[PDB]
Structure 1
Amino acid sequence: DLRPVVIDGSNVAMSHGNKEVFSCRGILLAVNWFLERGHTDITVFVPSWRKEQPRPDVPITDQHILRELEKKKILVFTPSRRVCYDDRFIVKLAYESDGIVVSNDTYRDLQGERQEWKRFIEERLLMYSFVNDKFMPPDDPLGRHGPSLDNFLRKKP
């Protein structure tokens, strides 16, 4: 029906947090935007270490939301222990499920690594802005030479 959606959880939370705080409400707001439109295939990746106690250099708000979304099978923790794999999981999953990635990160390093991921990101990256709690994706994500947001999120127009 609709393409699978993969949300770069950290990119969205930091964005909603004005790039100063990991804002978990940002993730929930992005998730709800897709849910409201009837999406059922939504995966949000976040590194497992975001479950730990906040260091003072890694502030986080509304942390309780992460386990709530995990319990709803929407959020999936990416592994980490005392290194991470976050961006690669995001891109690999979206690519292999022929879905879309929600992030403002363009993953330049991954683009240079595999050409198929370079082209995938060029065609499937959905960028956005937050205005306070308003999640705003572009109406024409690929421009005049592209589909409507509506069709961009669908397997077929």
Structure 2
Amino acid sequence: GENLRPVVINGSNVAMSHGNKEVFSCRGIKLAVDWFLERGHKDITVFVPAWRKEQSRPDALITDQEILRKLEKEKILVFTPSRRVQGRRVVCYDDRFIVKLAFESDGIIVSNDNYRDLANEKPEWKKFIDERLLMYSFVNDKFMPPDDPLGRHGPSLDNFLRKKPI
């Protein structure tokens, strides 16, 4: 774990991708986290907005919701702030937590969204996101990051996840 990069996961992106594409499937977050834990990663942060603790509704379907609170108790998942004002949901943008933490910790970002609004705000964030984004596919419960996260000539996935190539 000493030579490994910190891992920051877009929890909502991963939960939408897993299972039914239109359902927030929390087992998907668990499966991604487990993929990194089994490789020895000890520094993993999953960000999810706090309002995903609300009860399942027809326009916000969720499965295995209890996973979120459990991962929070394990200090793997962190809720980003959300509240109500005058009956309206006021949500802090979780993408900024994800990018800022990965950037300040010299880590990698697990997400199929490449955050072009934040990239266009700060040139250093654009360069960081473009170099440190880990996209992925699920096949059922199989979490499959690409072995070539930066294409043909980039690092192997093994070396992408390390601080110093081995």
Flag whether TM exceeds 0.5 (same fold). Answer: yes
How far apart are the structure 2 equivalents of 1:117 and 1:49? 27
Matched, 1:84 2:92: yes
What percentage of aligned pairs have identical amino acids?
A: 87
Pick the aligned partner of 2:66 from 53, 64, 67. Answer: 64
User: TM-score, structure 2 length as denominator?
Assistant: 0.92
The one-letter amino acid of 1:79's match is P
TM-score (norm 1): 0.97
2:150 aligned partner, one-letter code: L
| Partner of residue 19 from structure 2, selected from 14, 17, 20 | 17
Cα distance in 1 between the residues matched to 2:26 and 2:152: 33
Q: Which has the larger radius of gyration?
A: 2
Runs of 4+ with >4 A deviation: none
> Is it true that 1:50 corresponds to 2:58 in the alignment?
no
Q: Deviations over 1:127-152 (max 9, x none)?
A: 00011101010001112221110000
The residue correspondences of 1:104-119 to structure 2 (distance < 5 A) are: 104-119=112-127
Structure 2 regions of 5+ residues with no counterpart? 85-90
1:84 Cα deviation (Å)? Answer: 2.1
Task: Name the stretch that deviates more: 17-26 or 28-37.
Answer: 17-26
- Aligned partner of 1:137 in structure 2 is 145
Question: Are the counterparts in 1 of residues 19 and 140 from structure 2 also a CA contact under 8 Å?
Answer: no
Aligned alpha-carbon RMSD (Å): 0.8
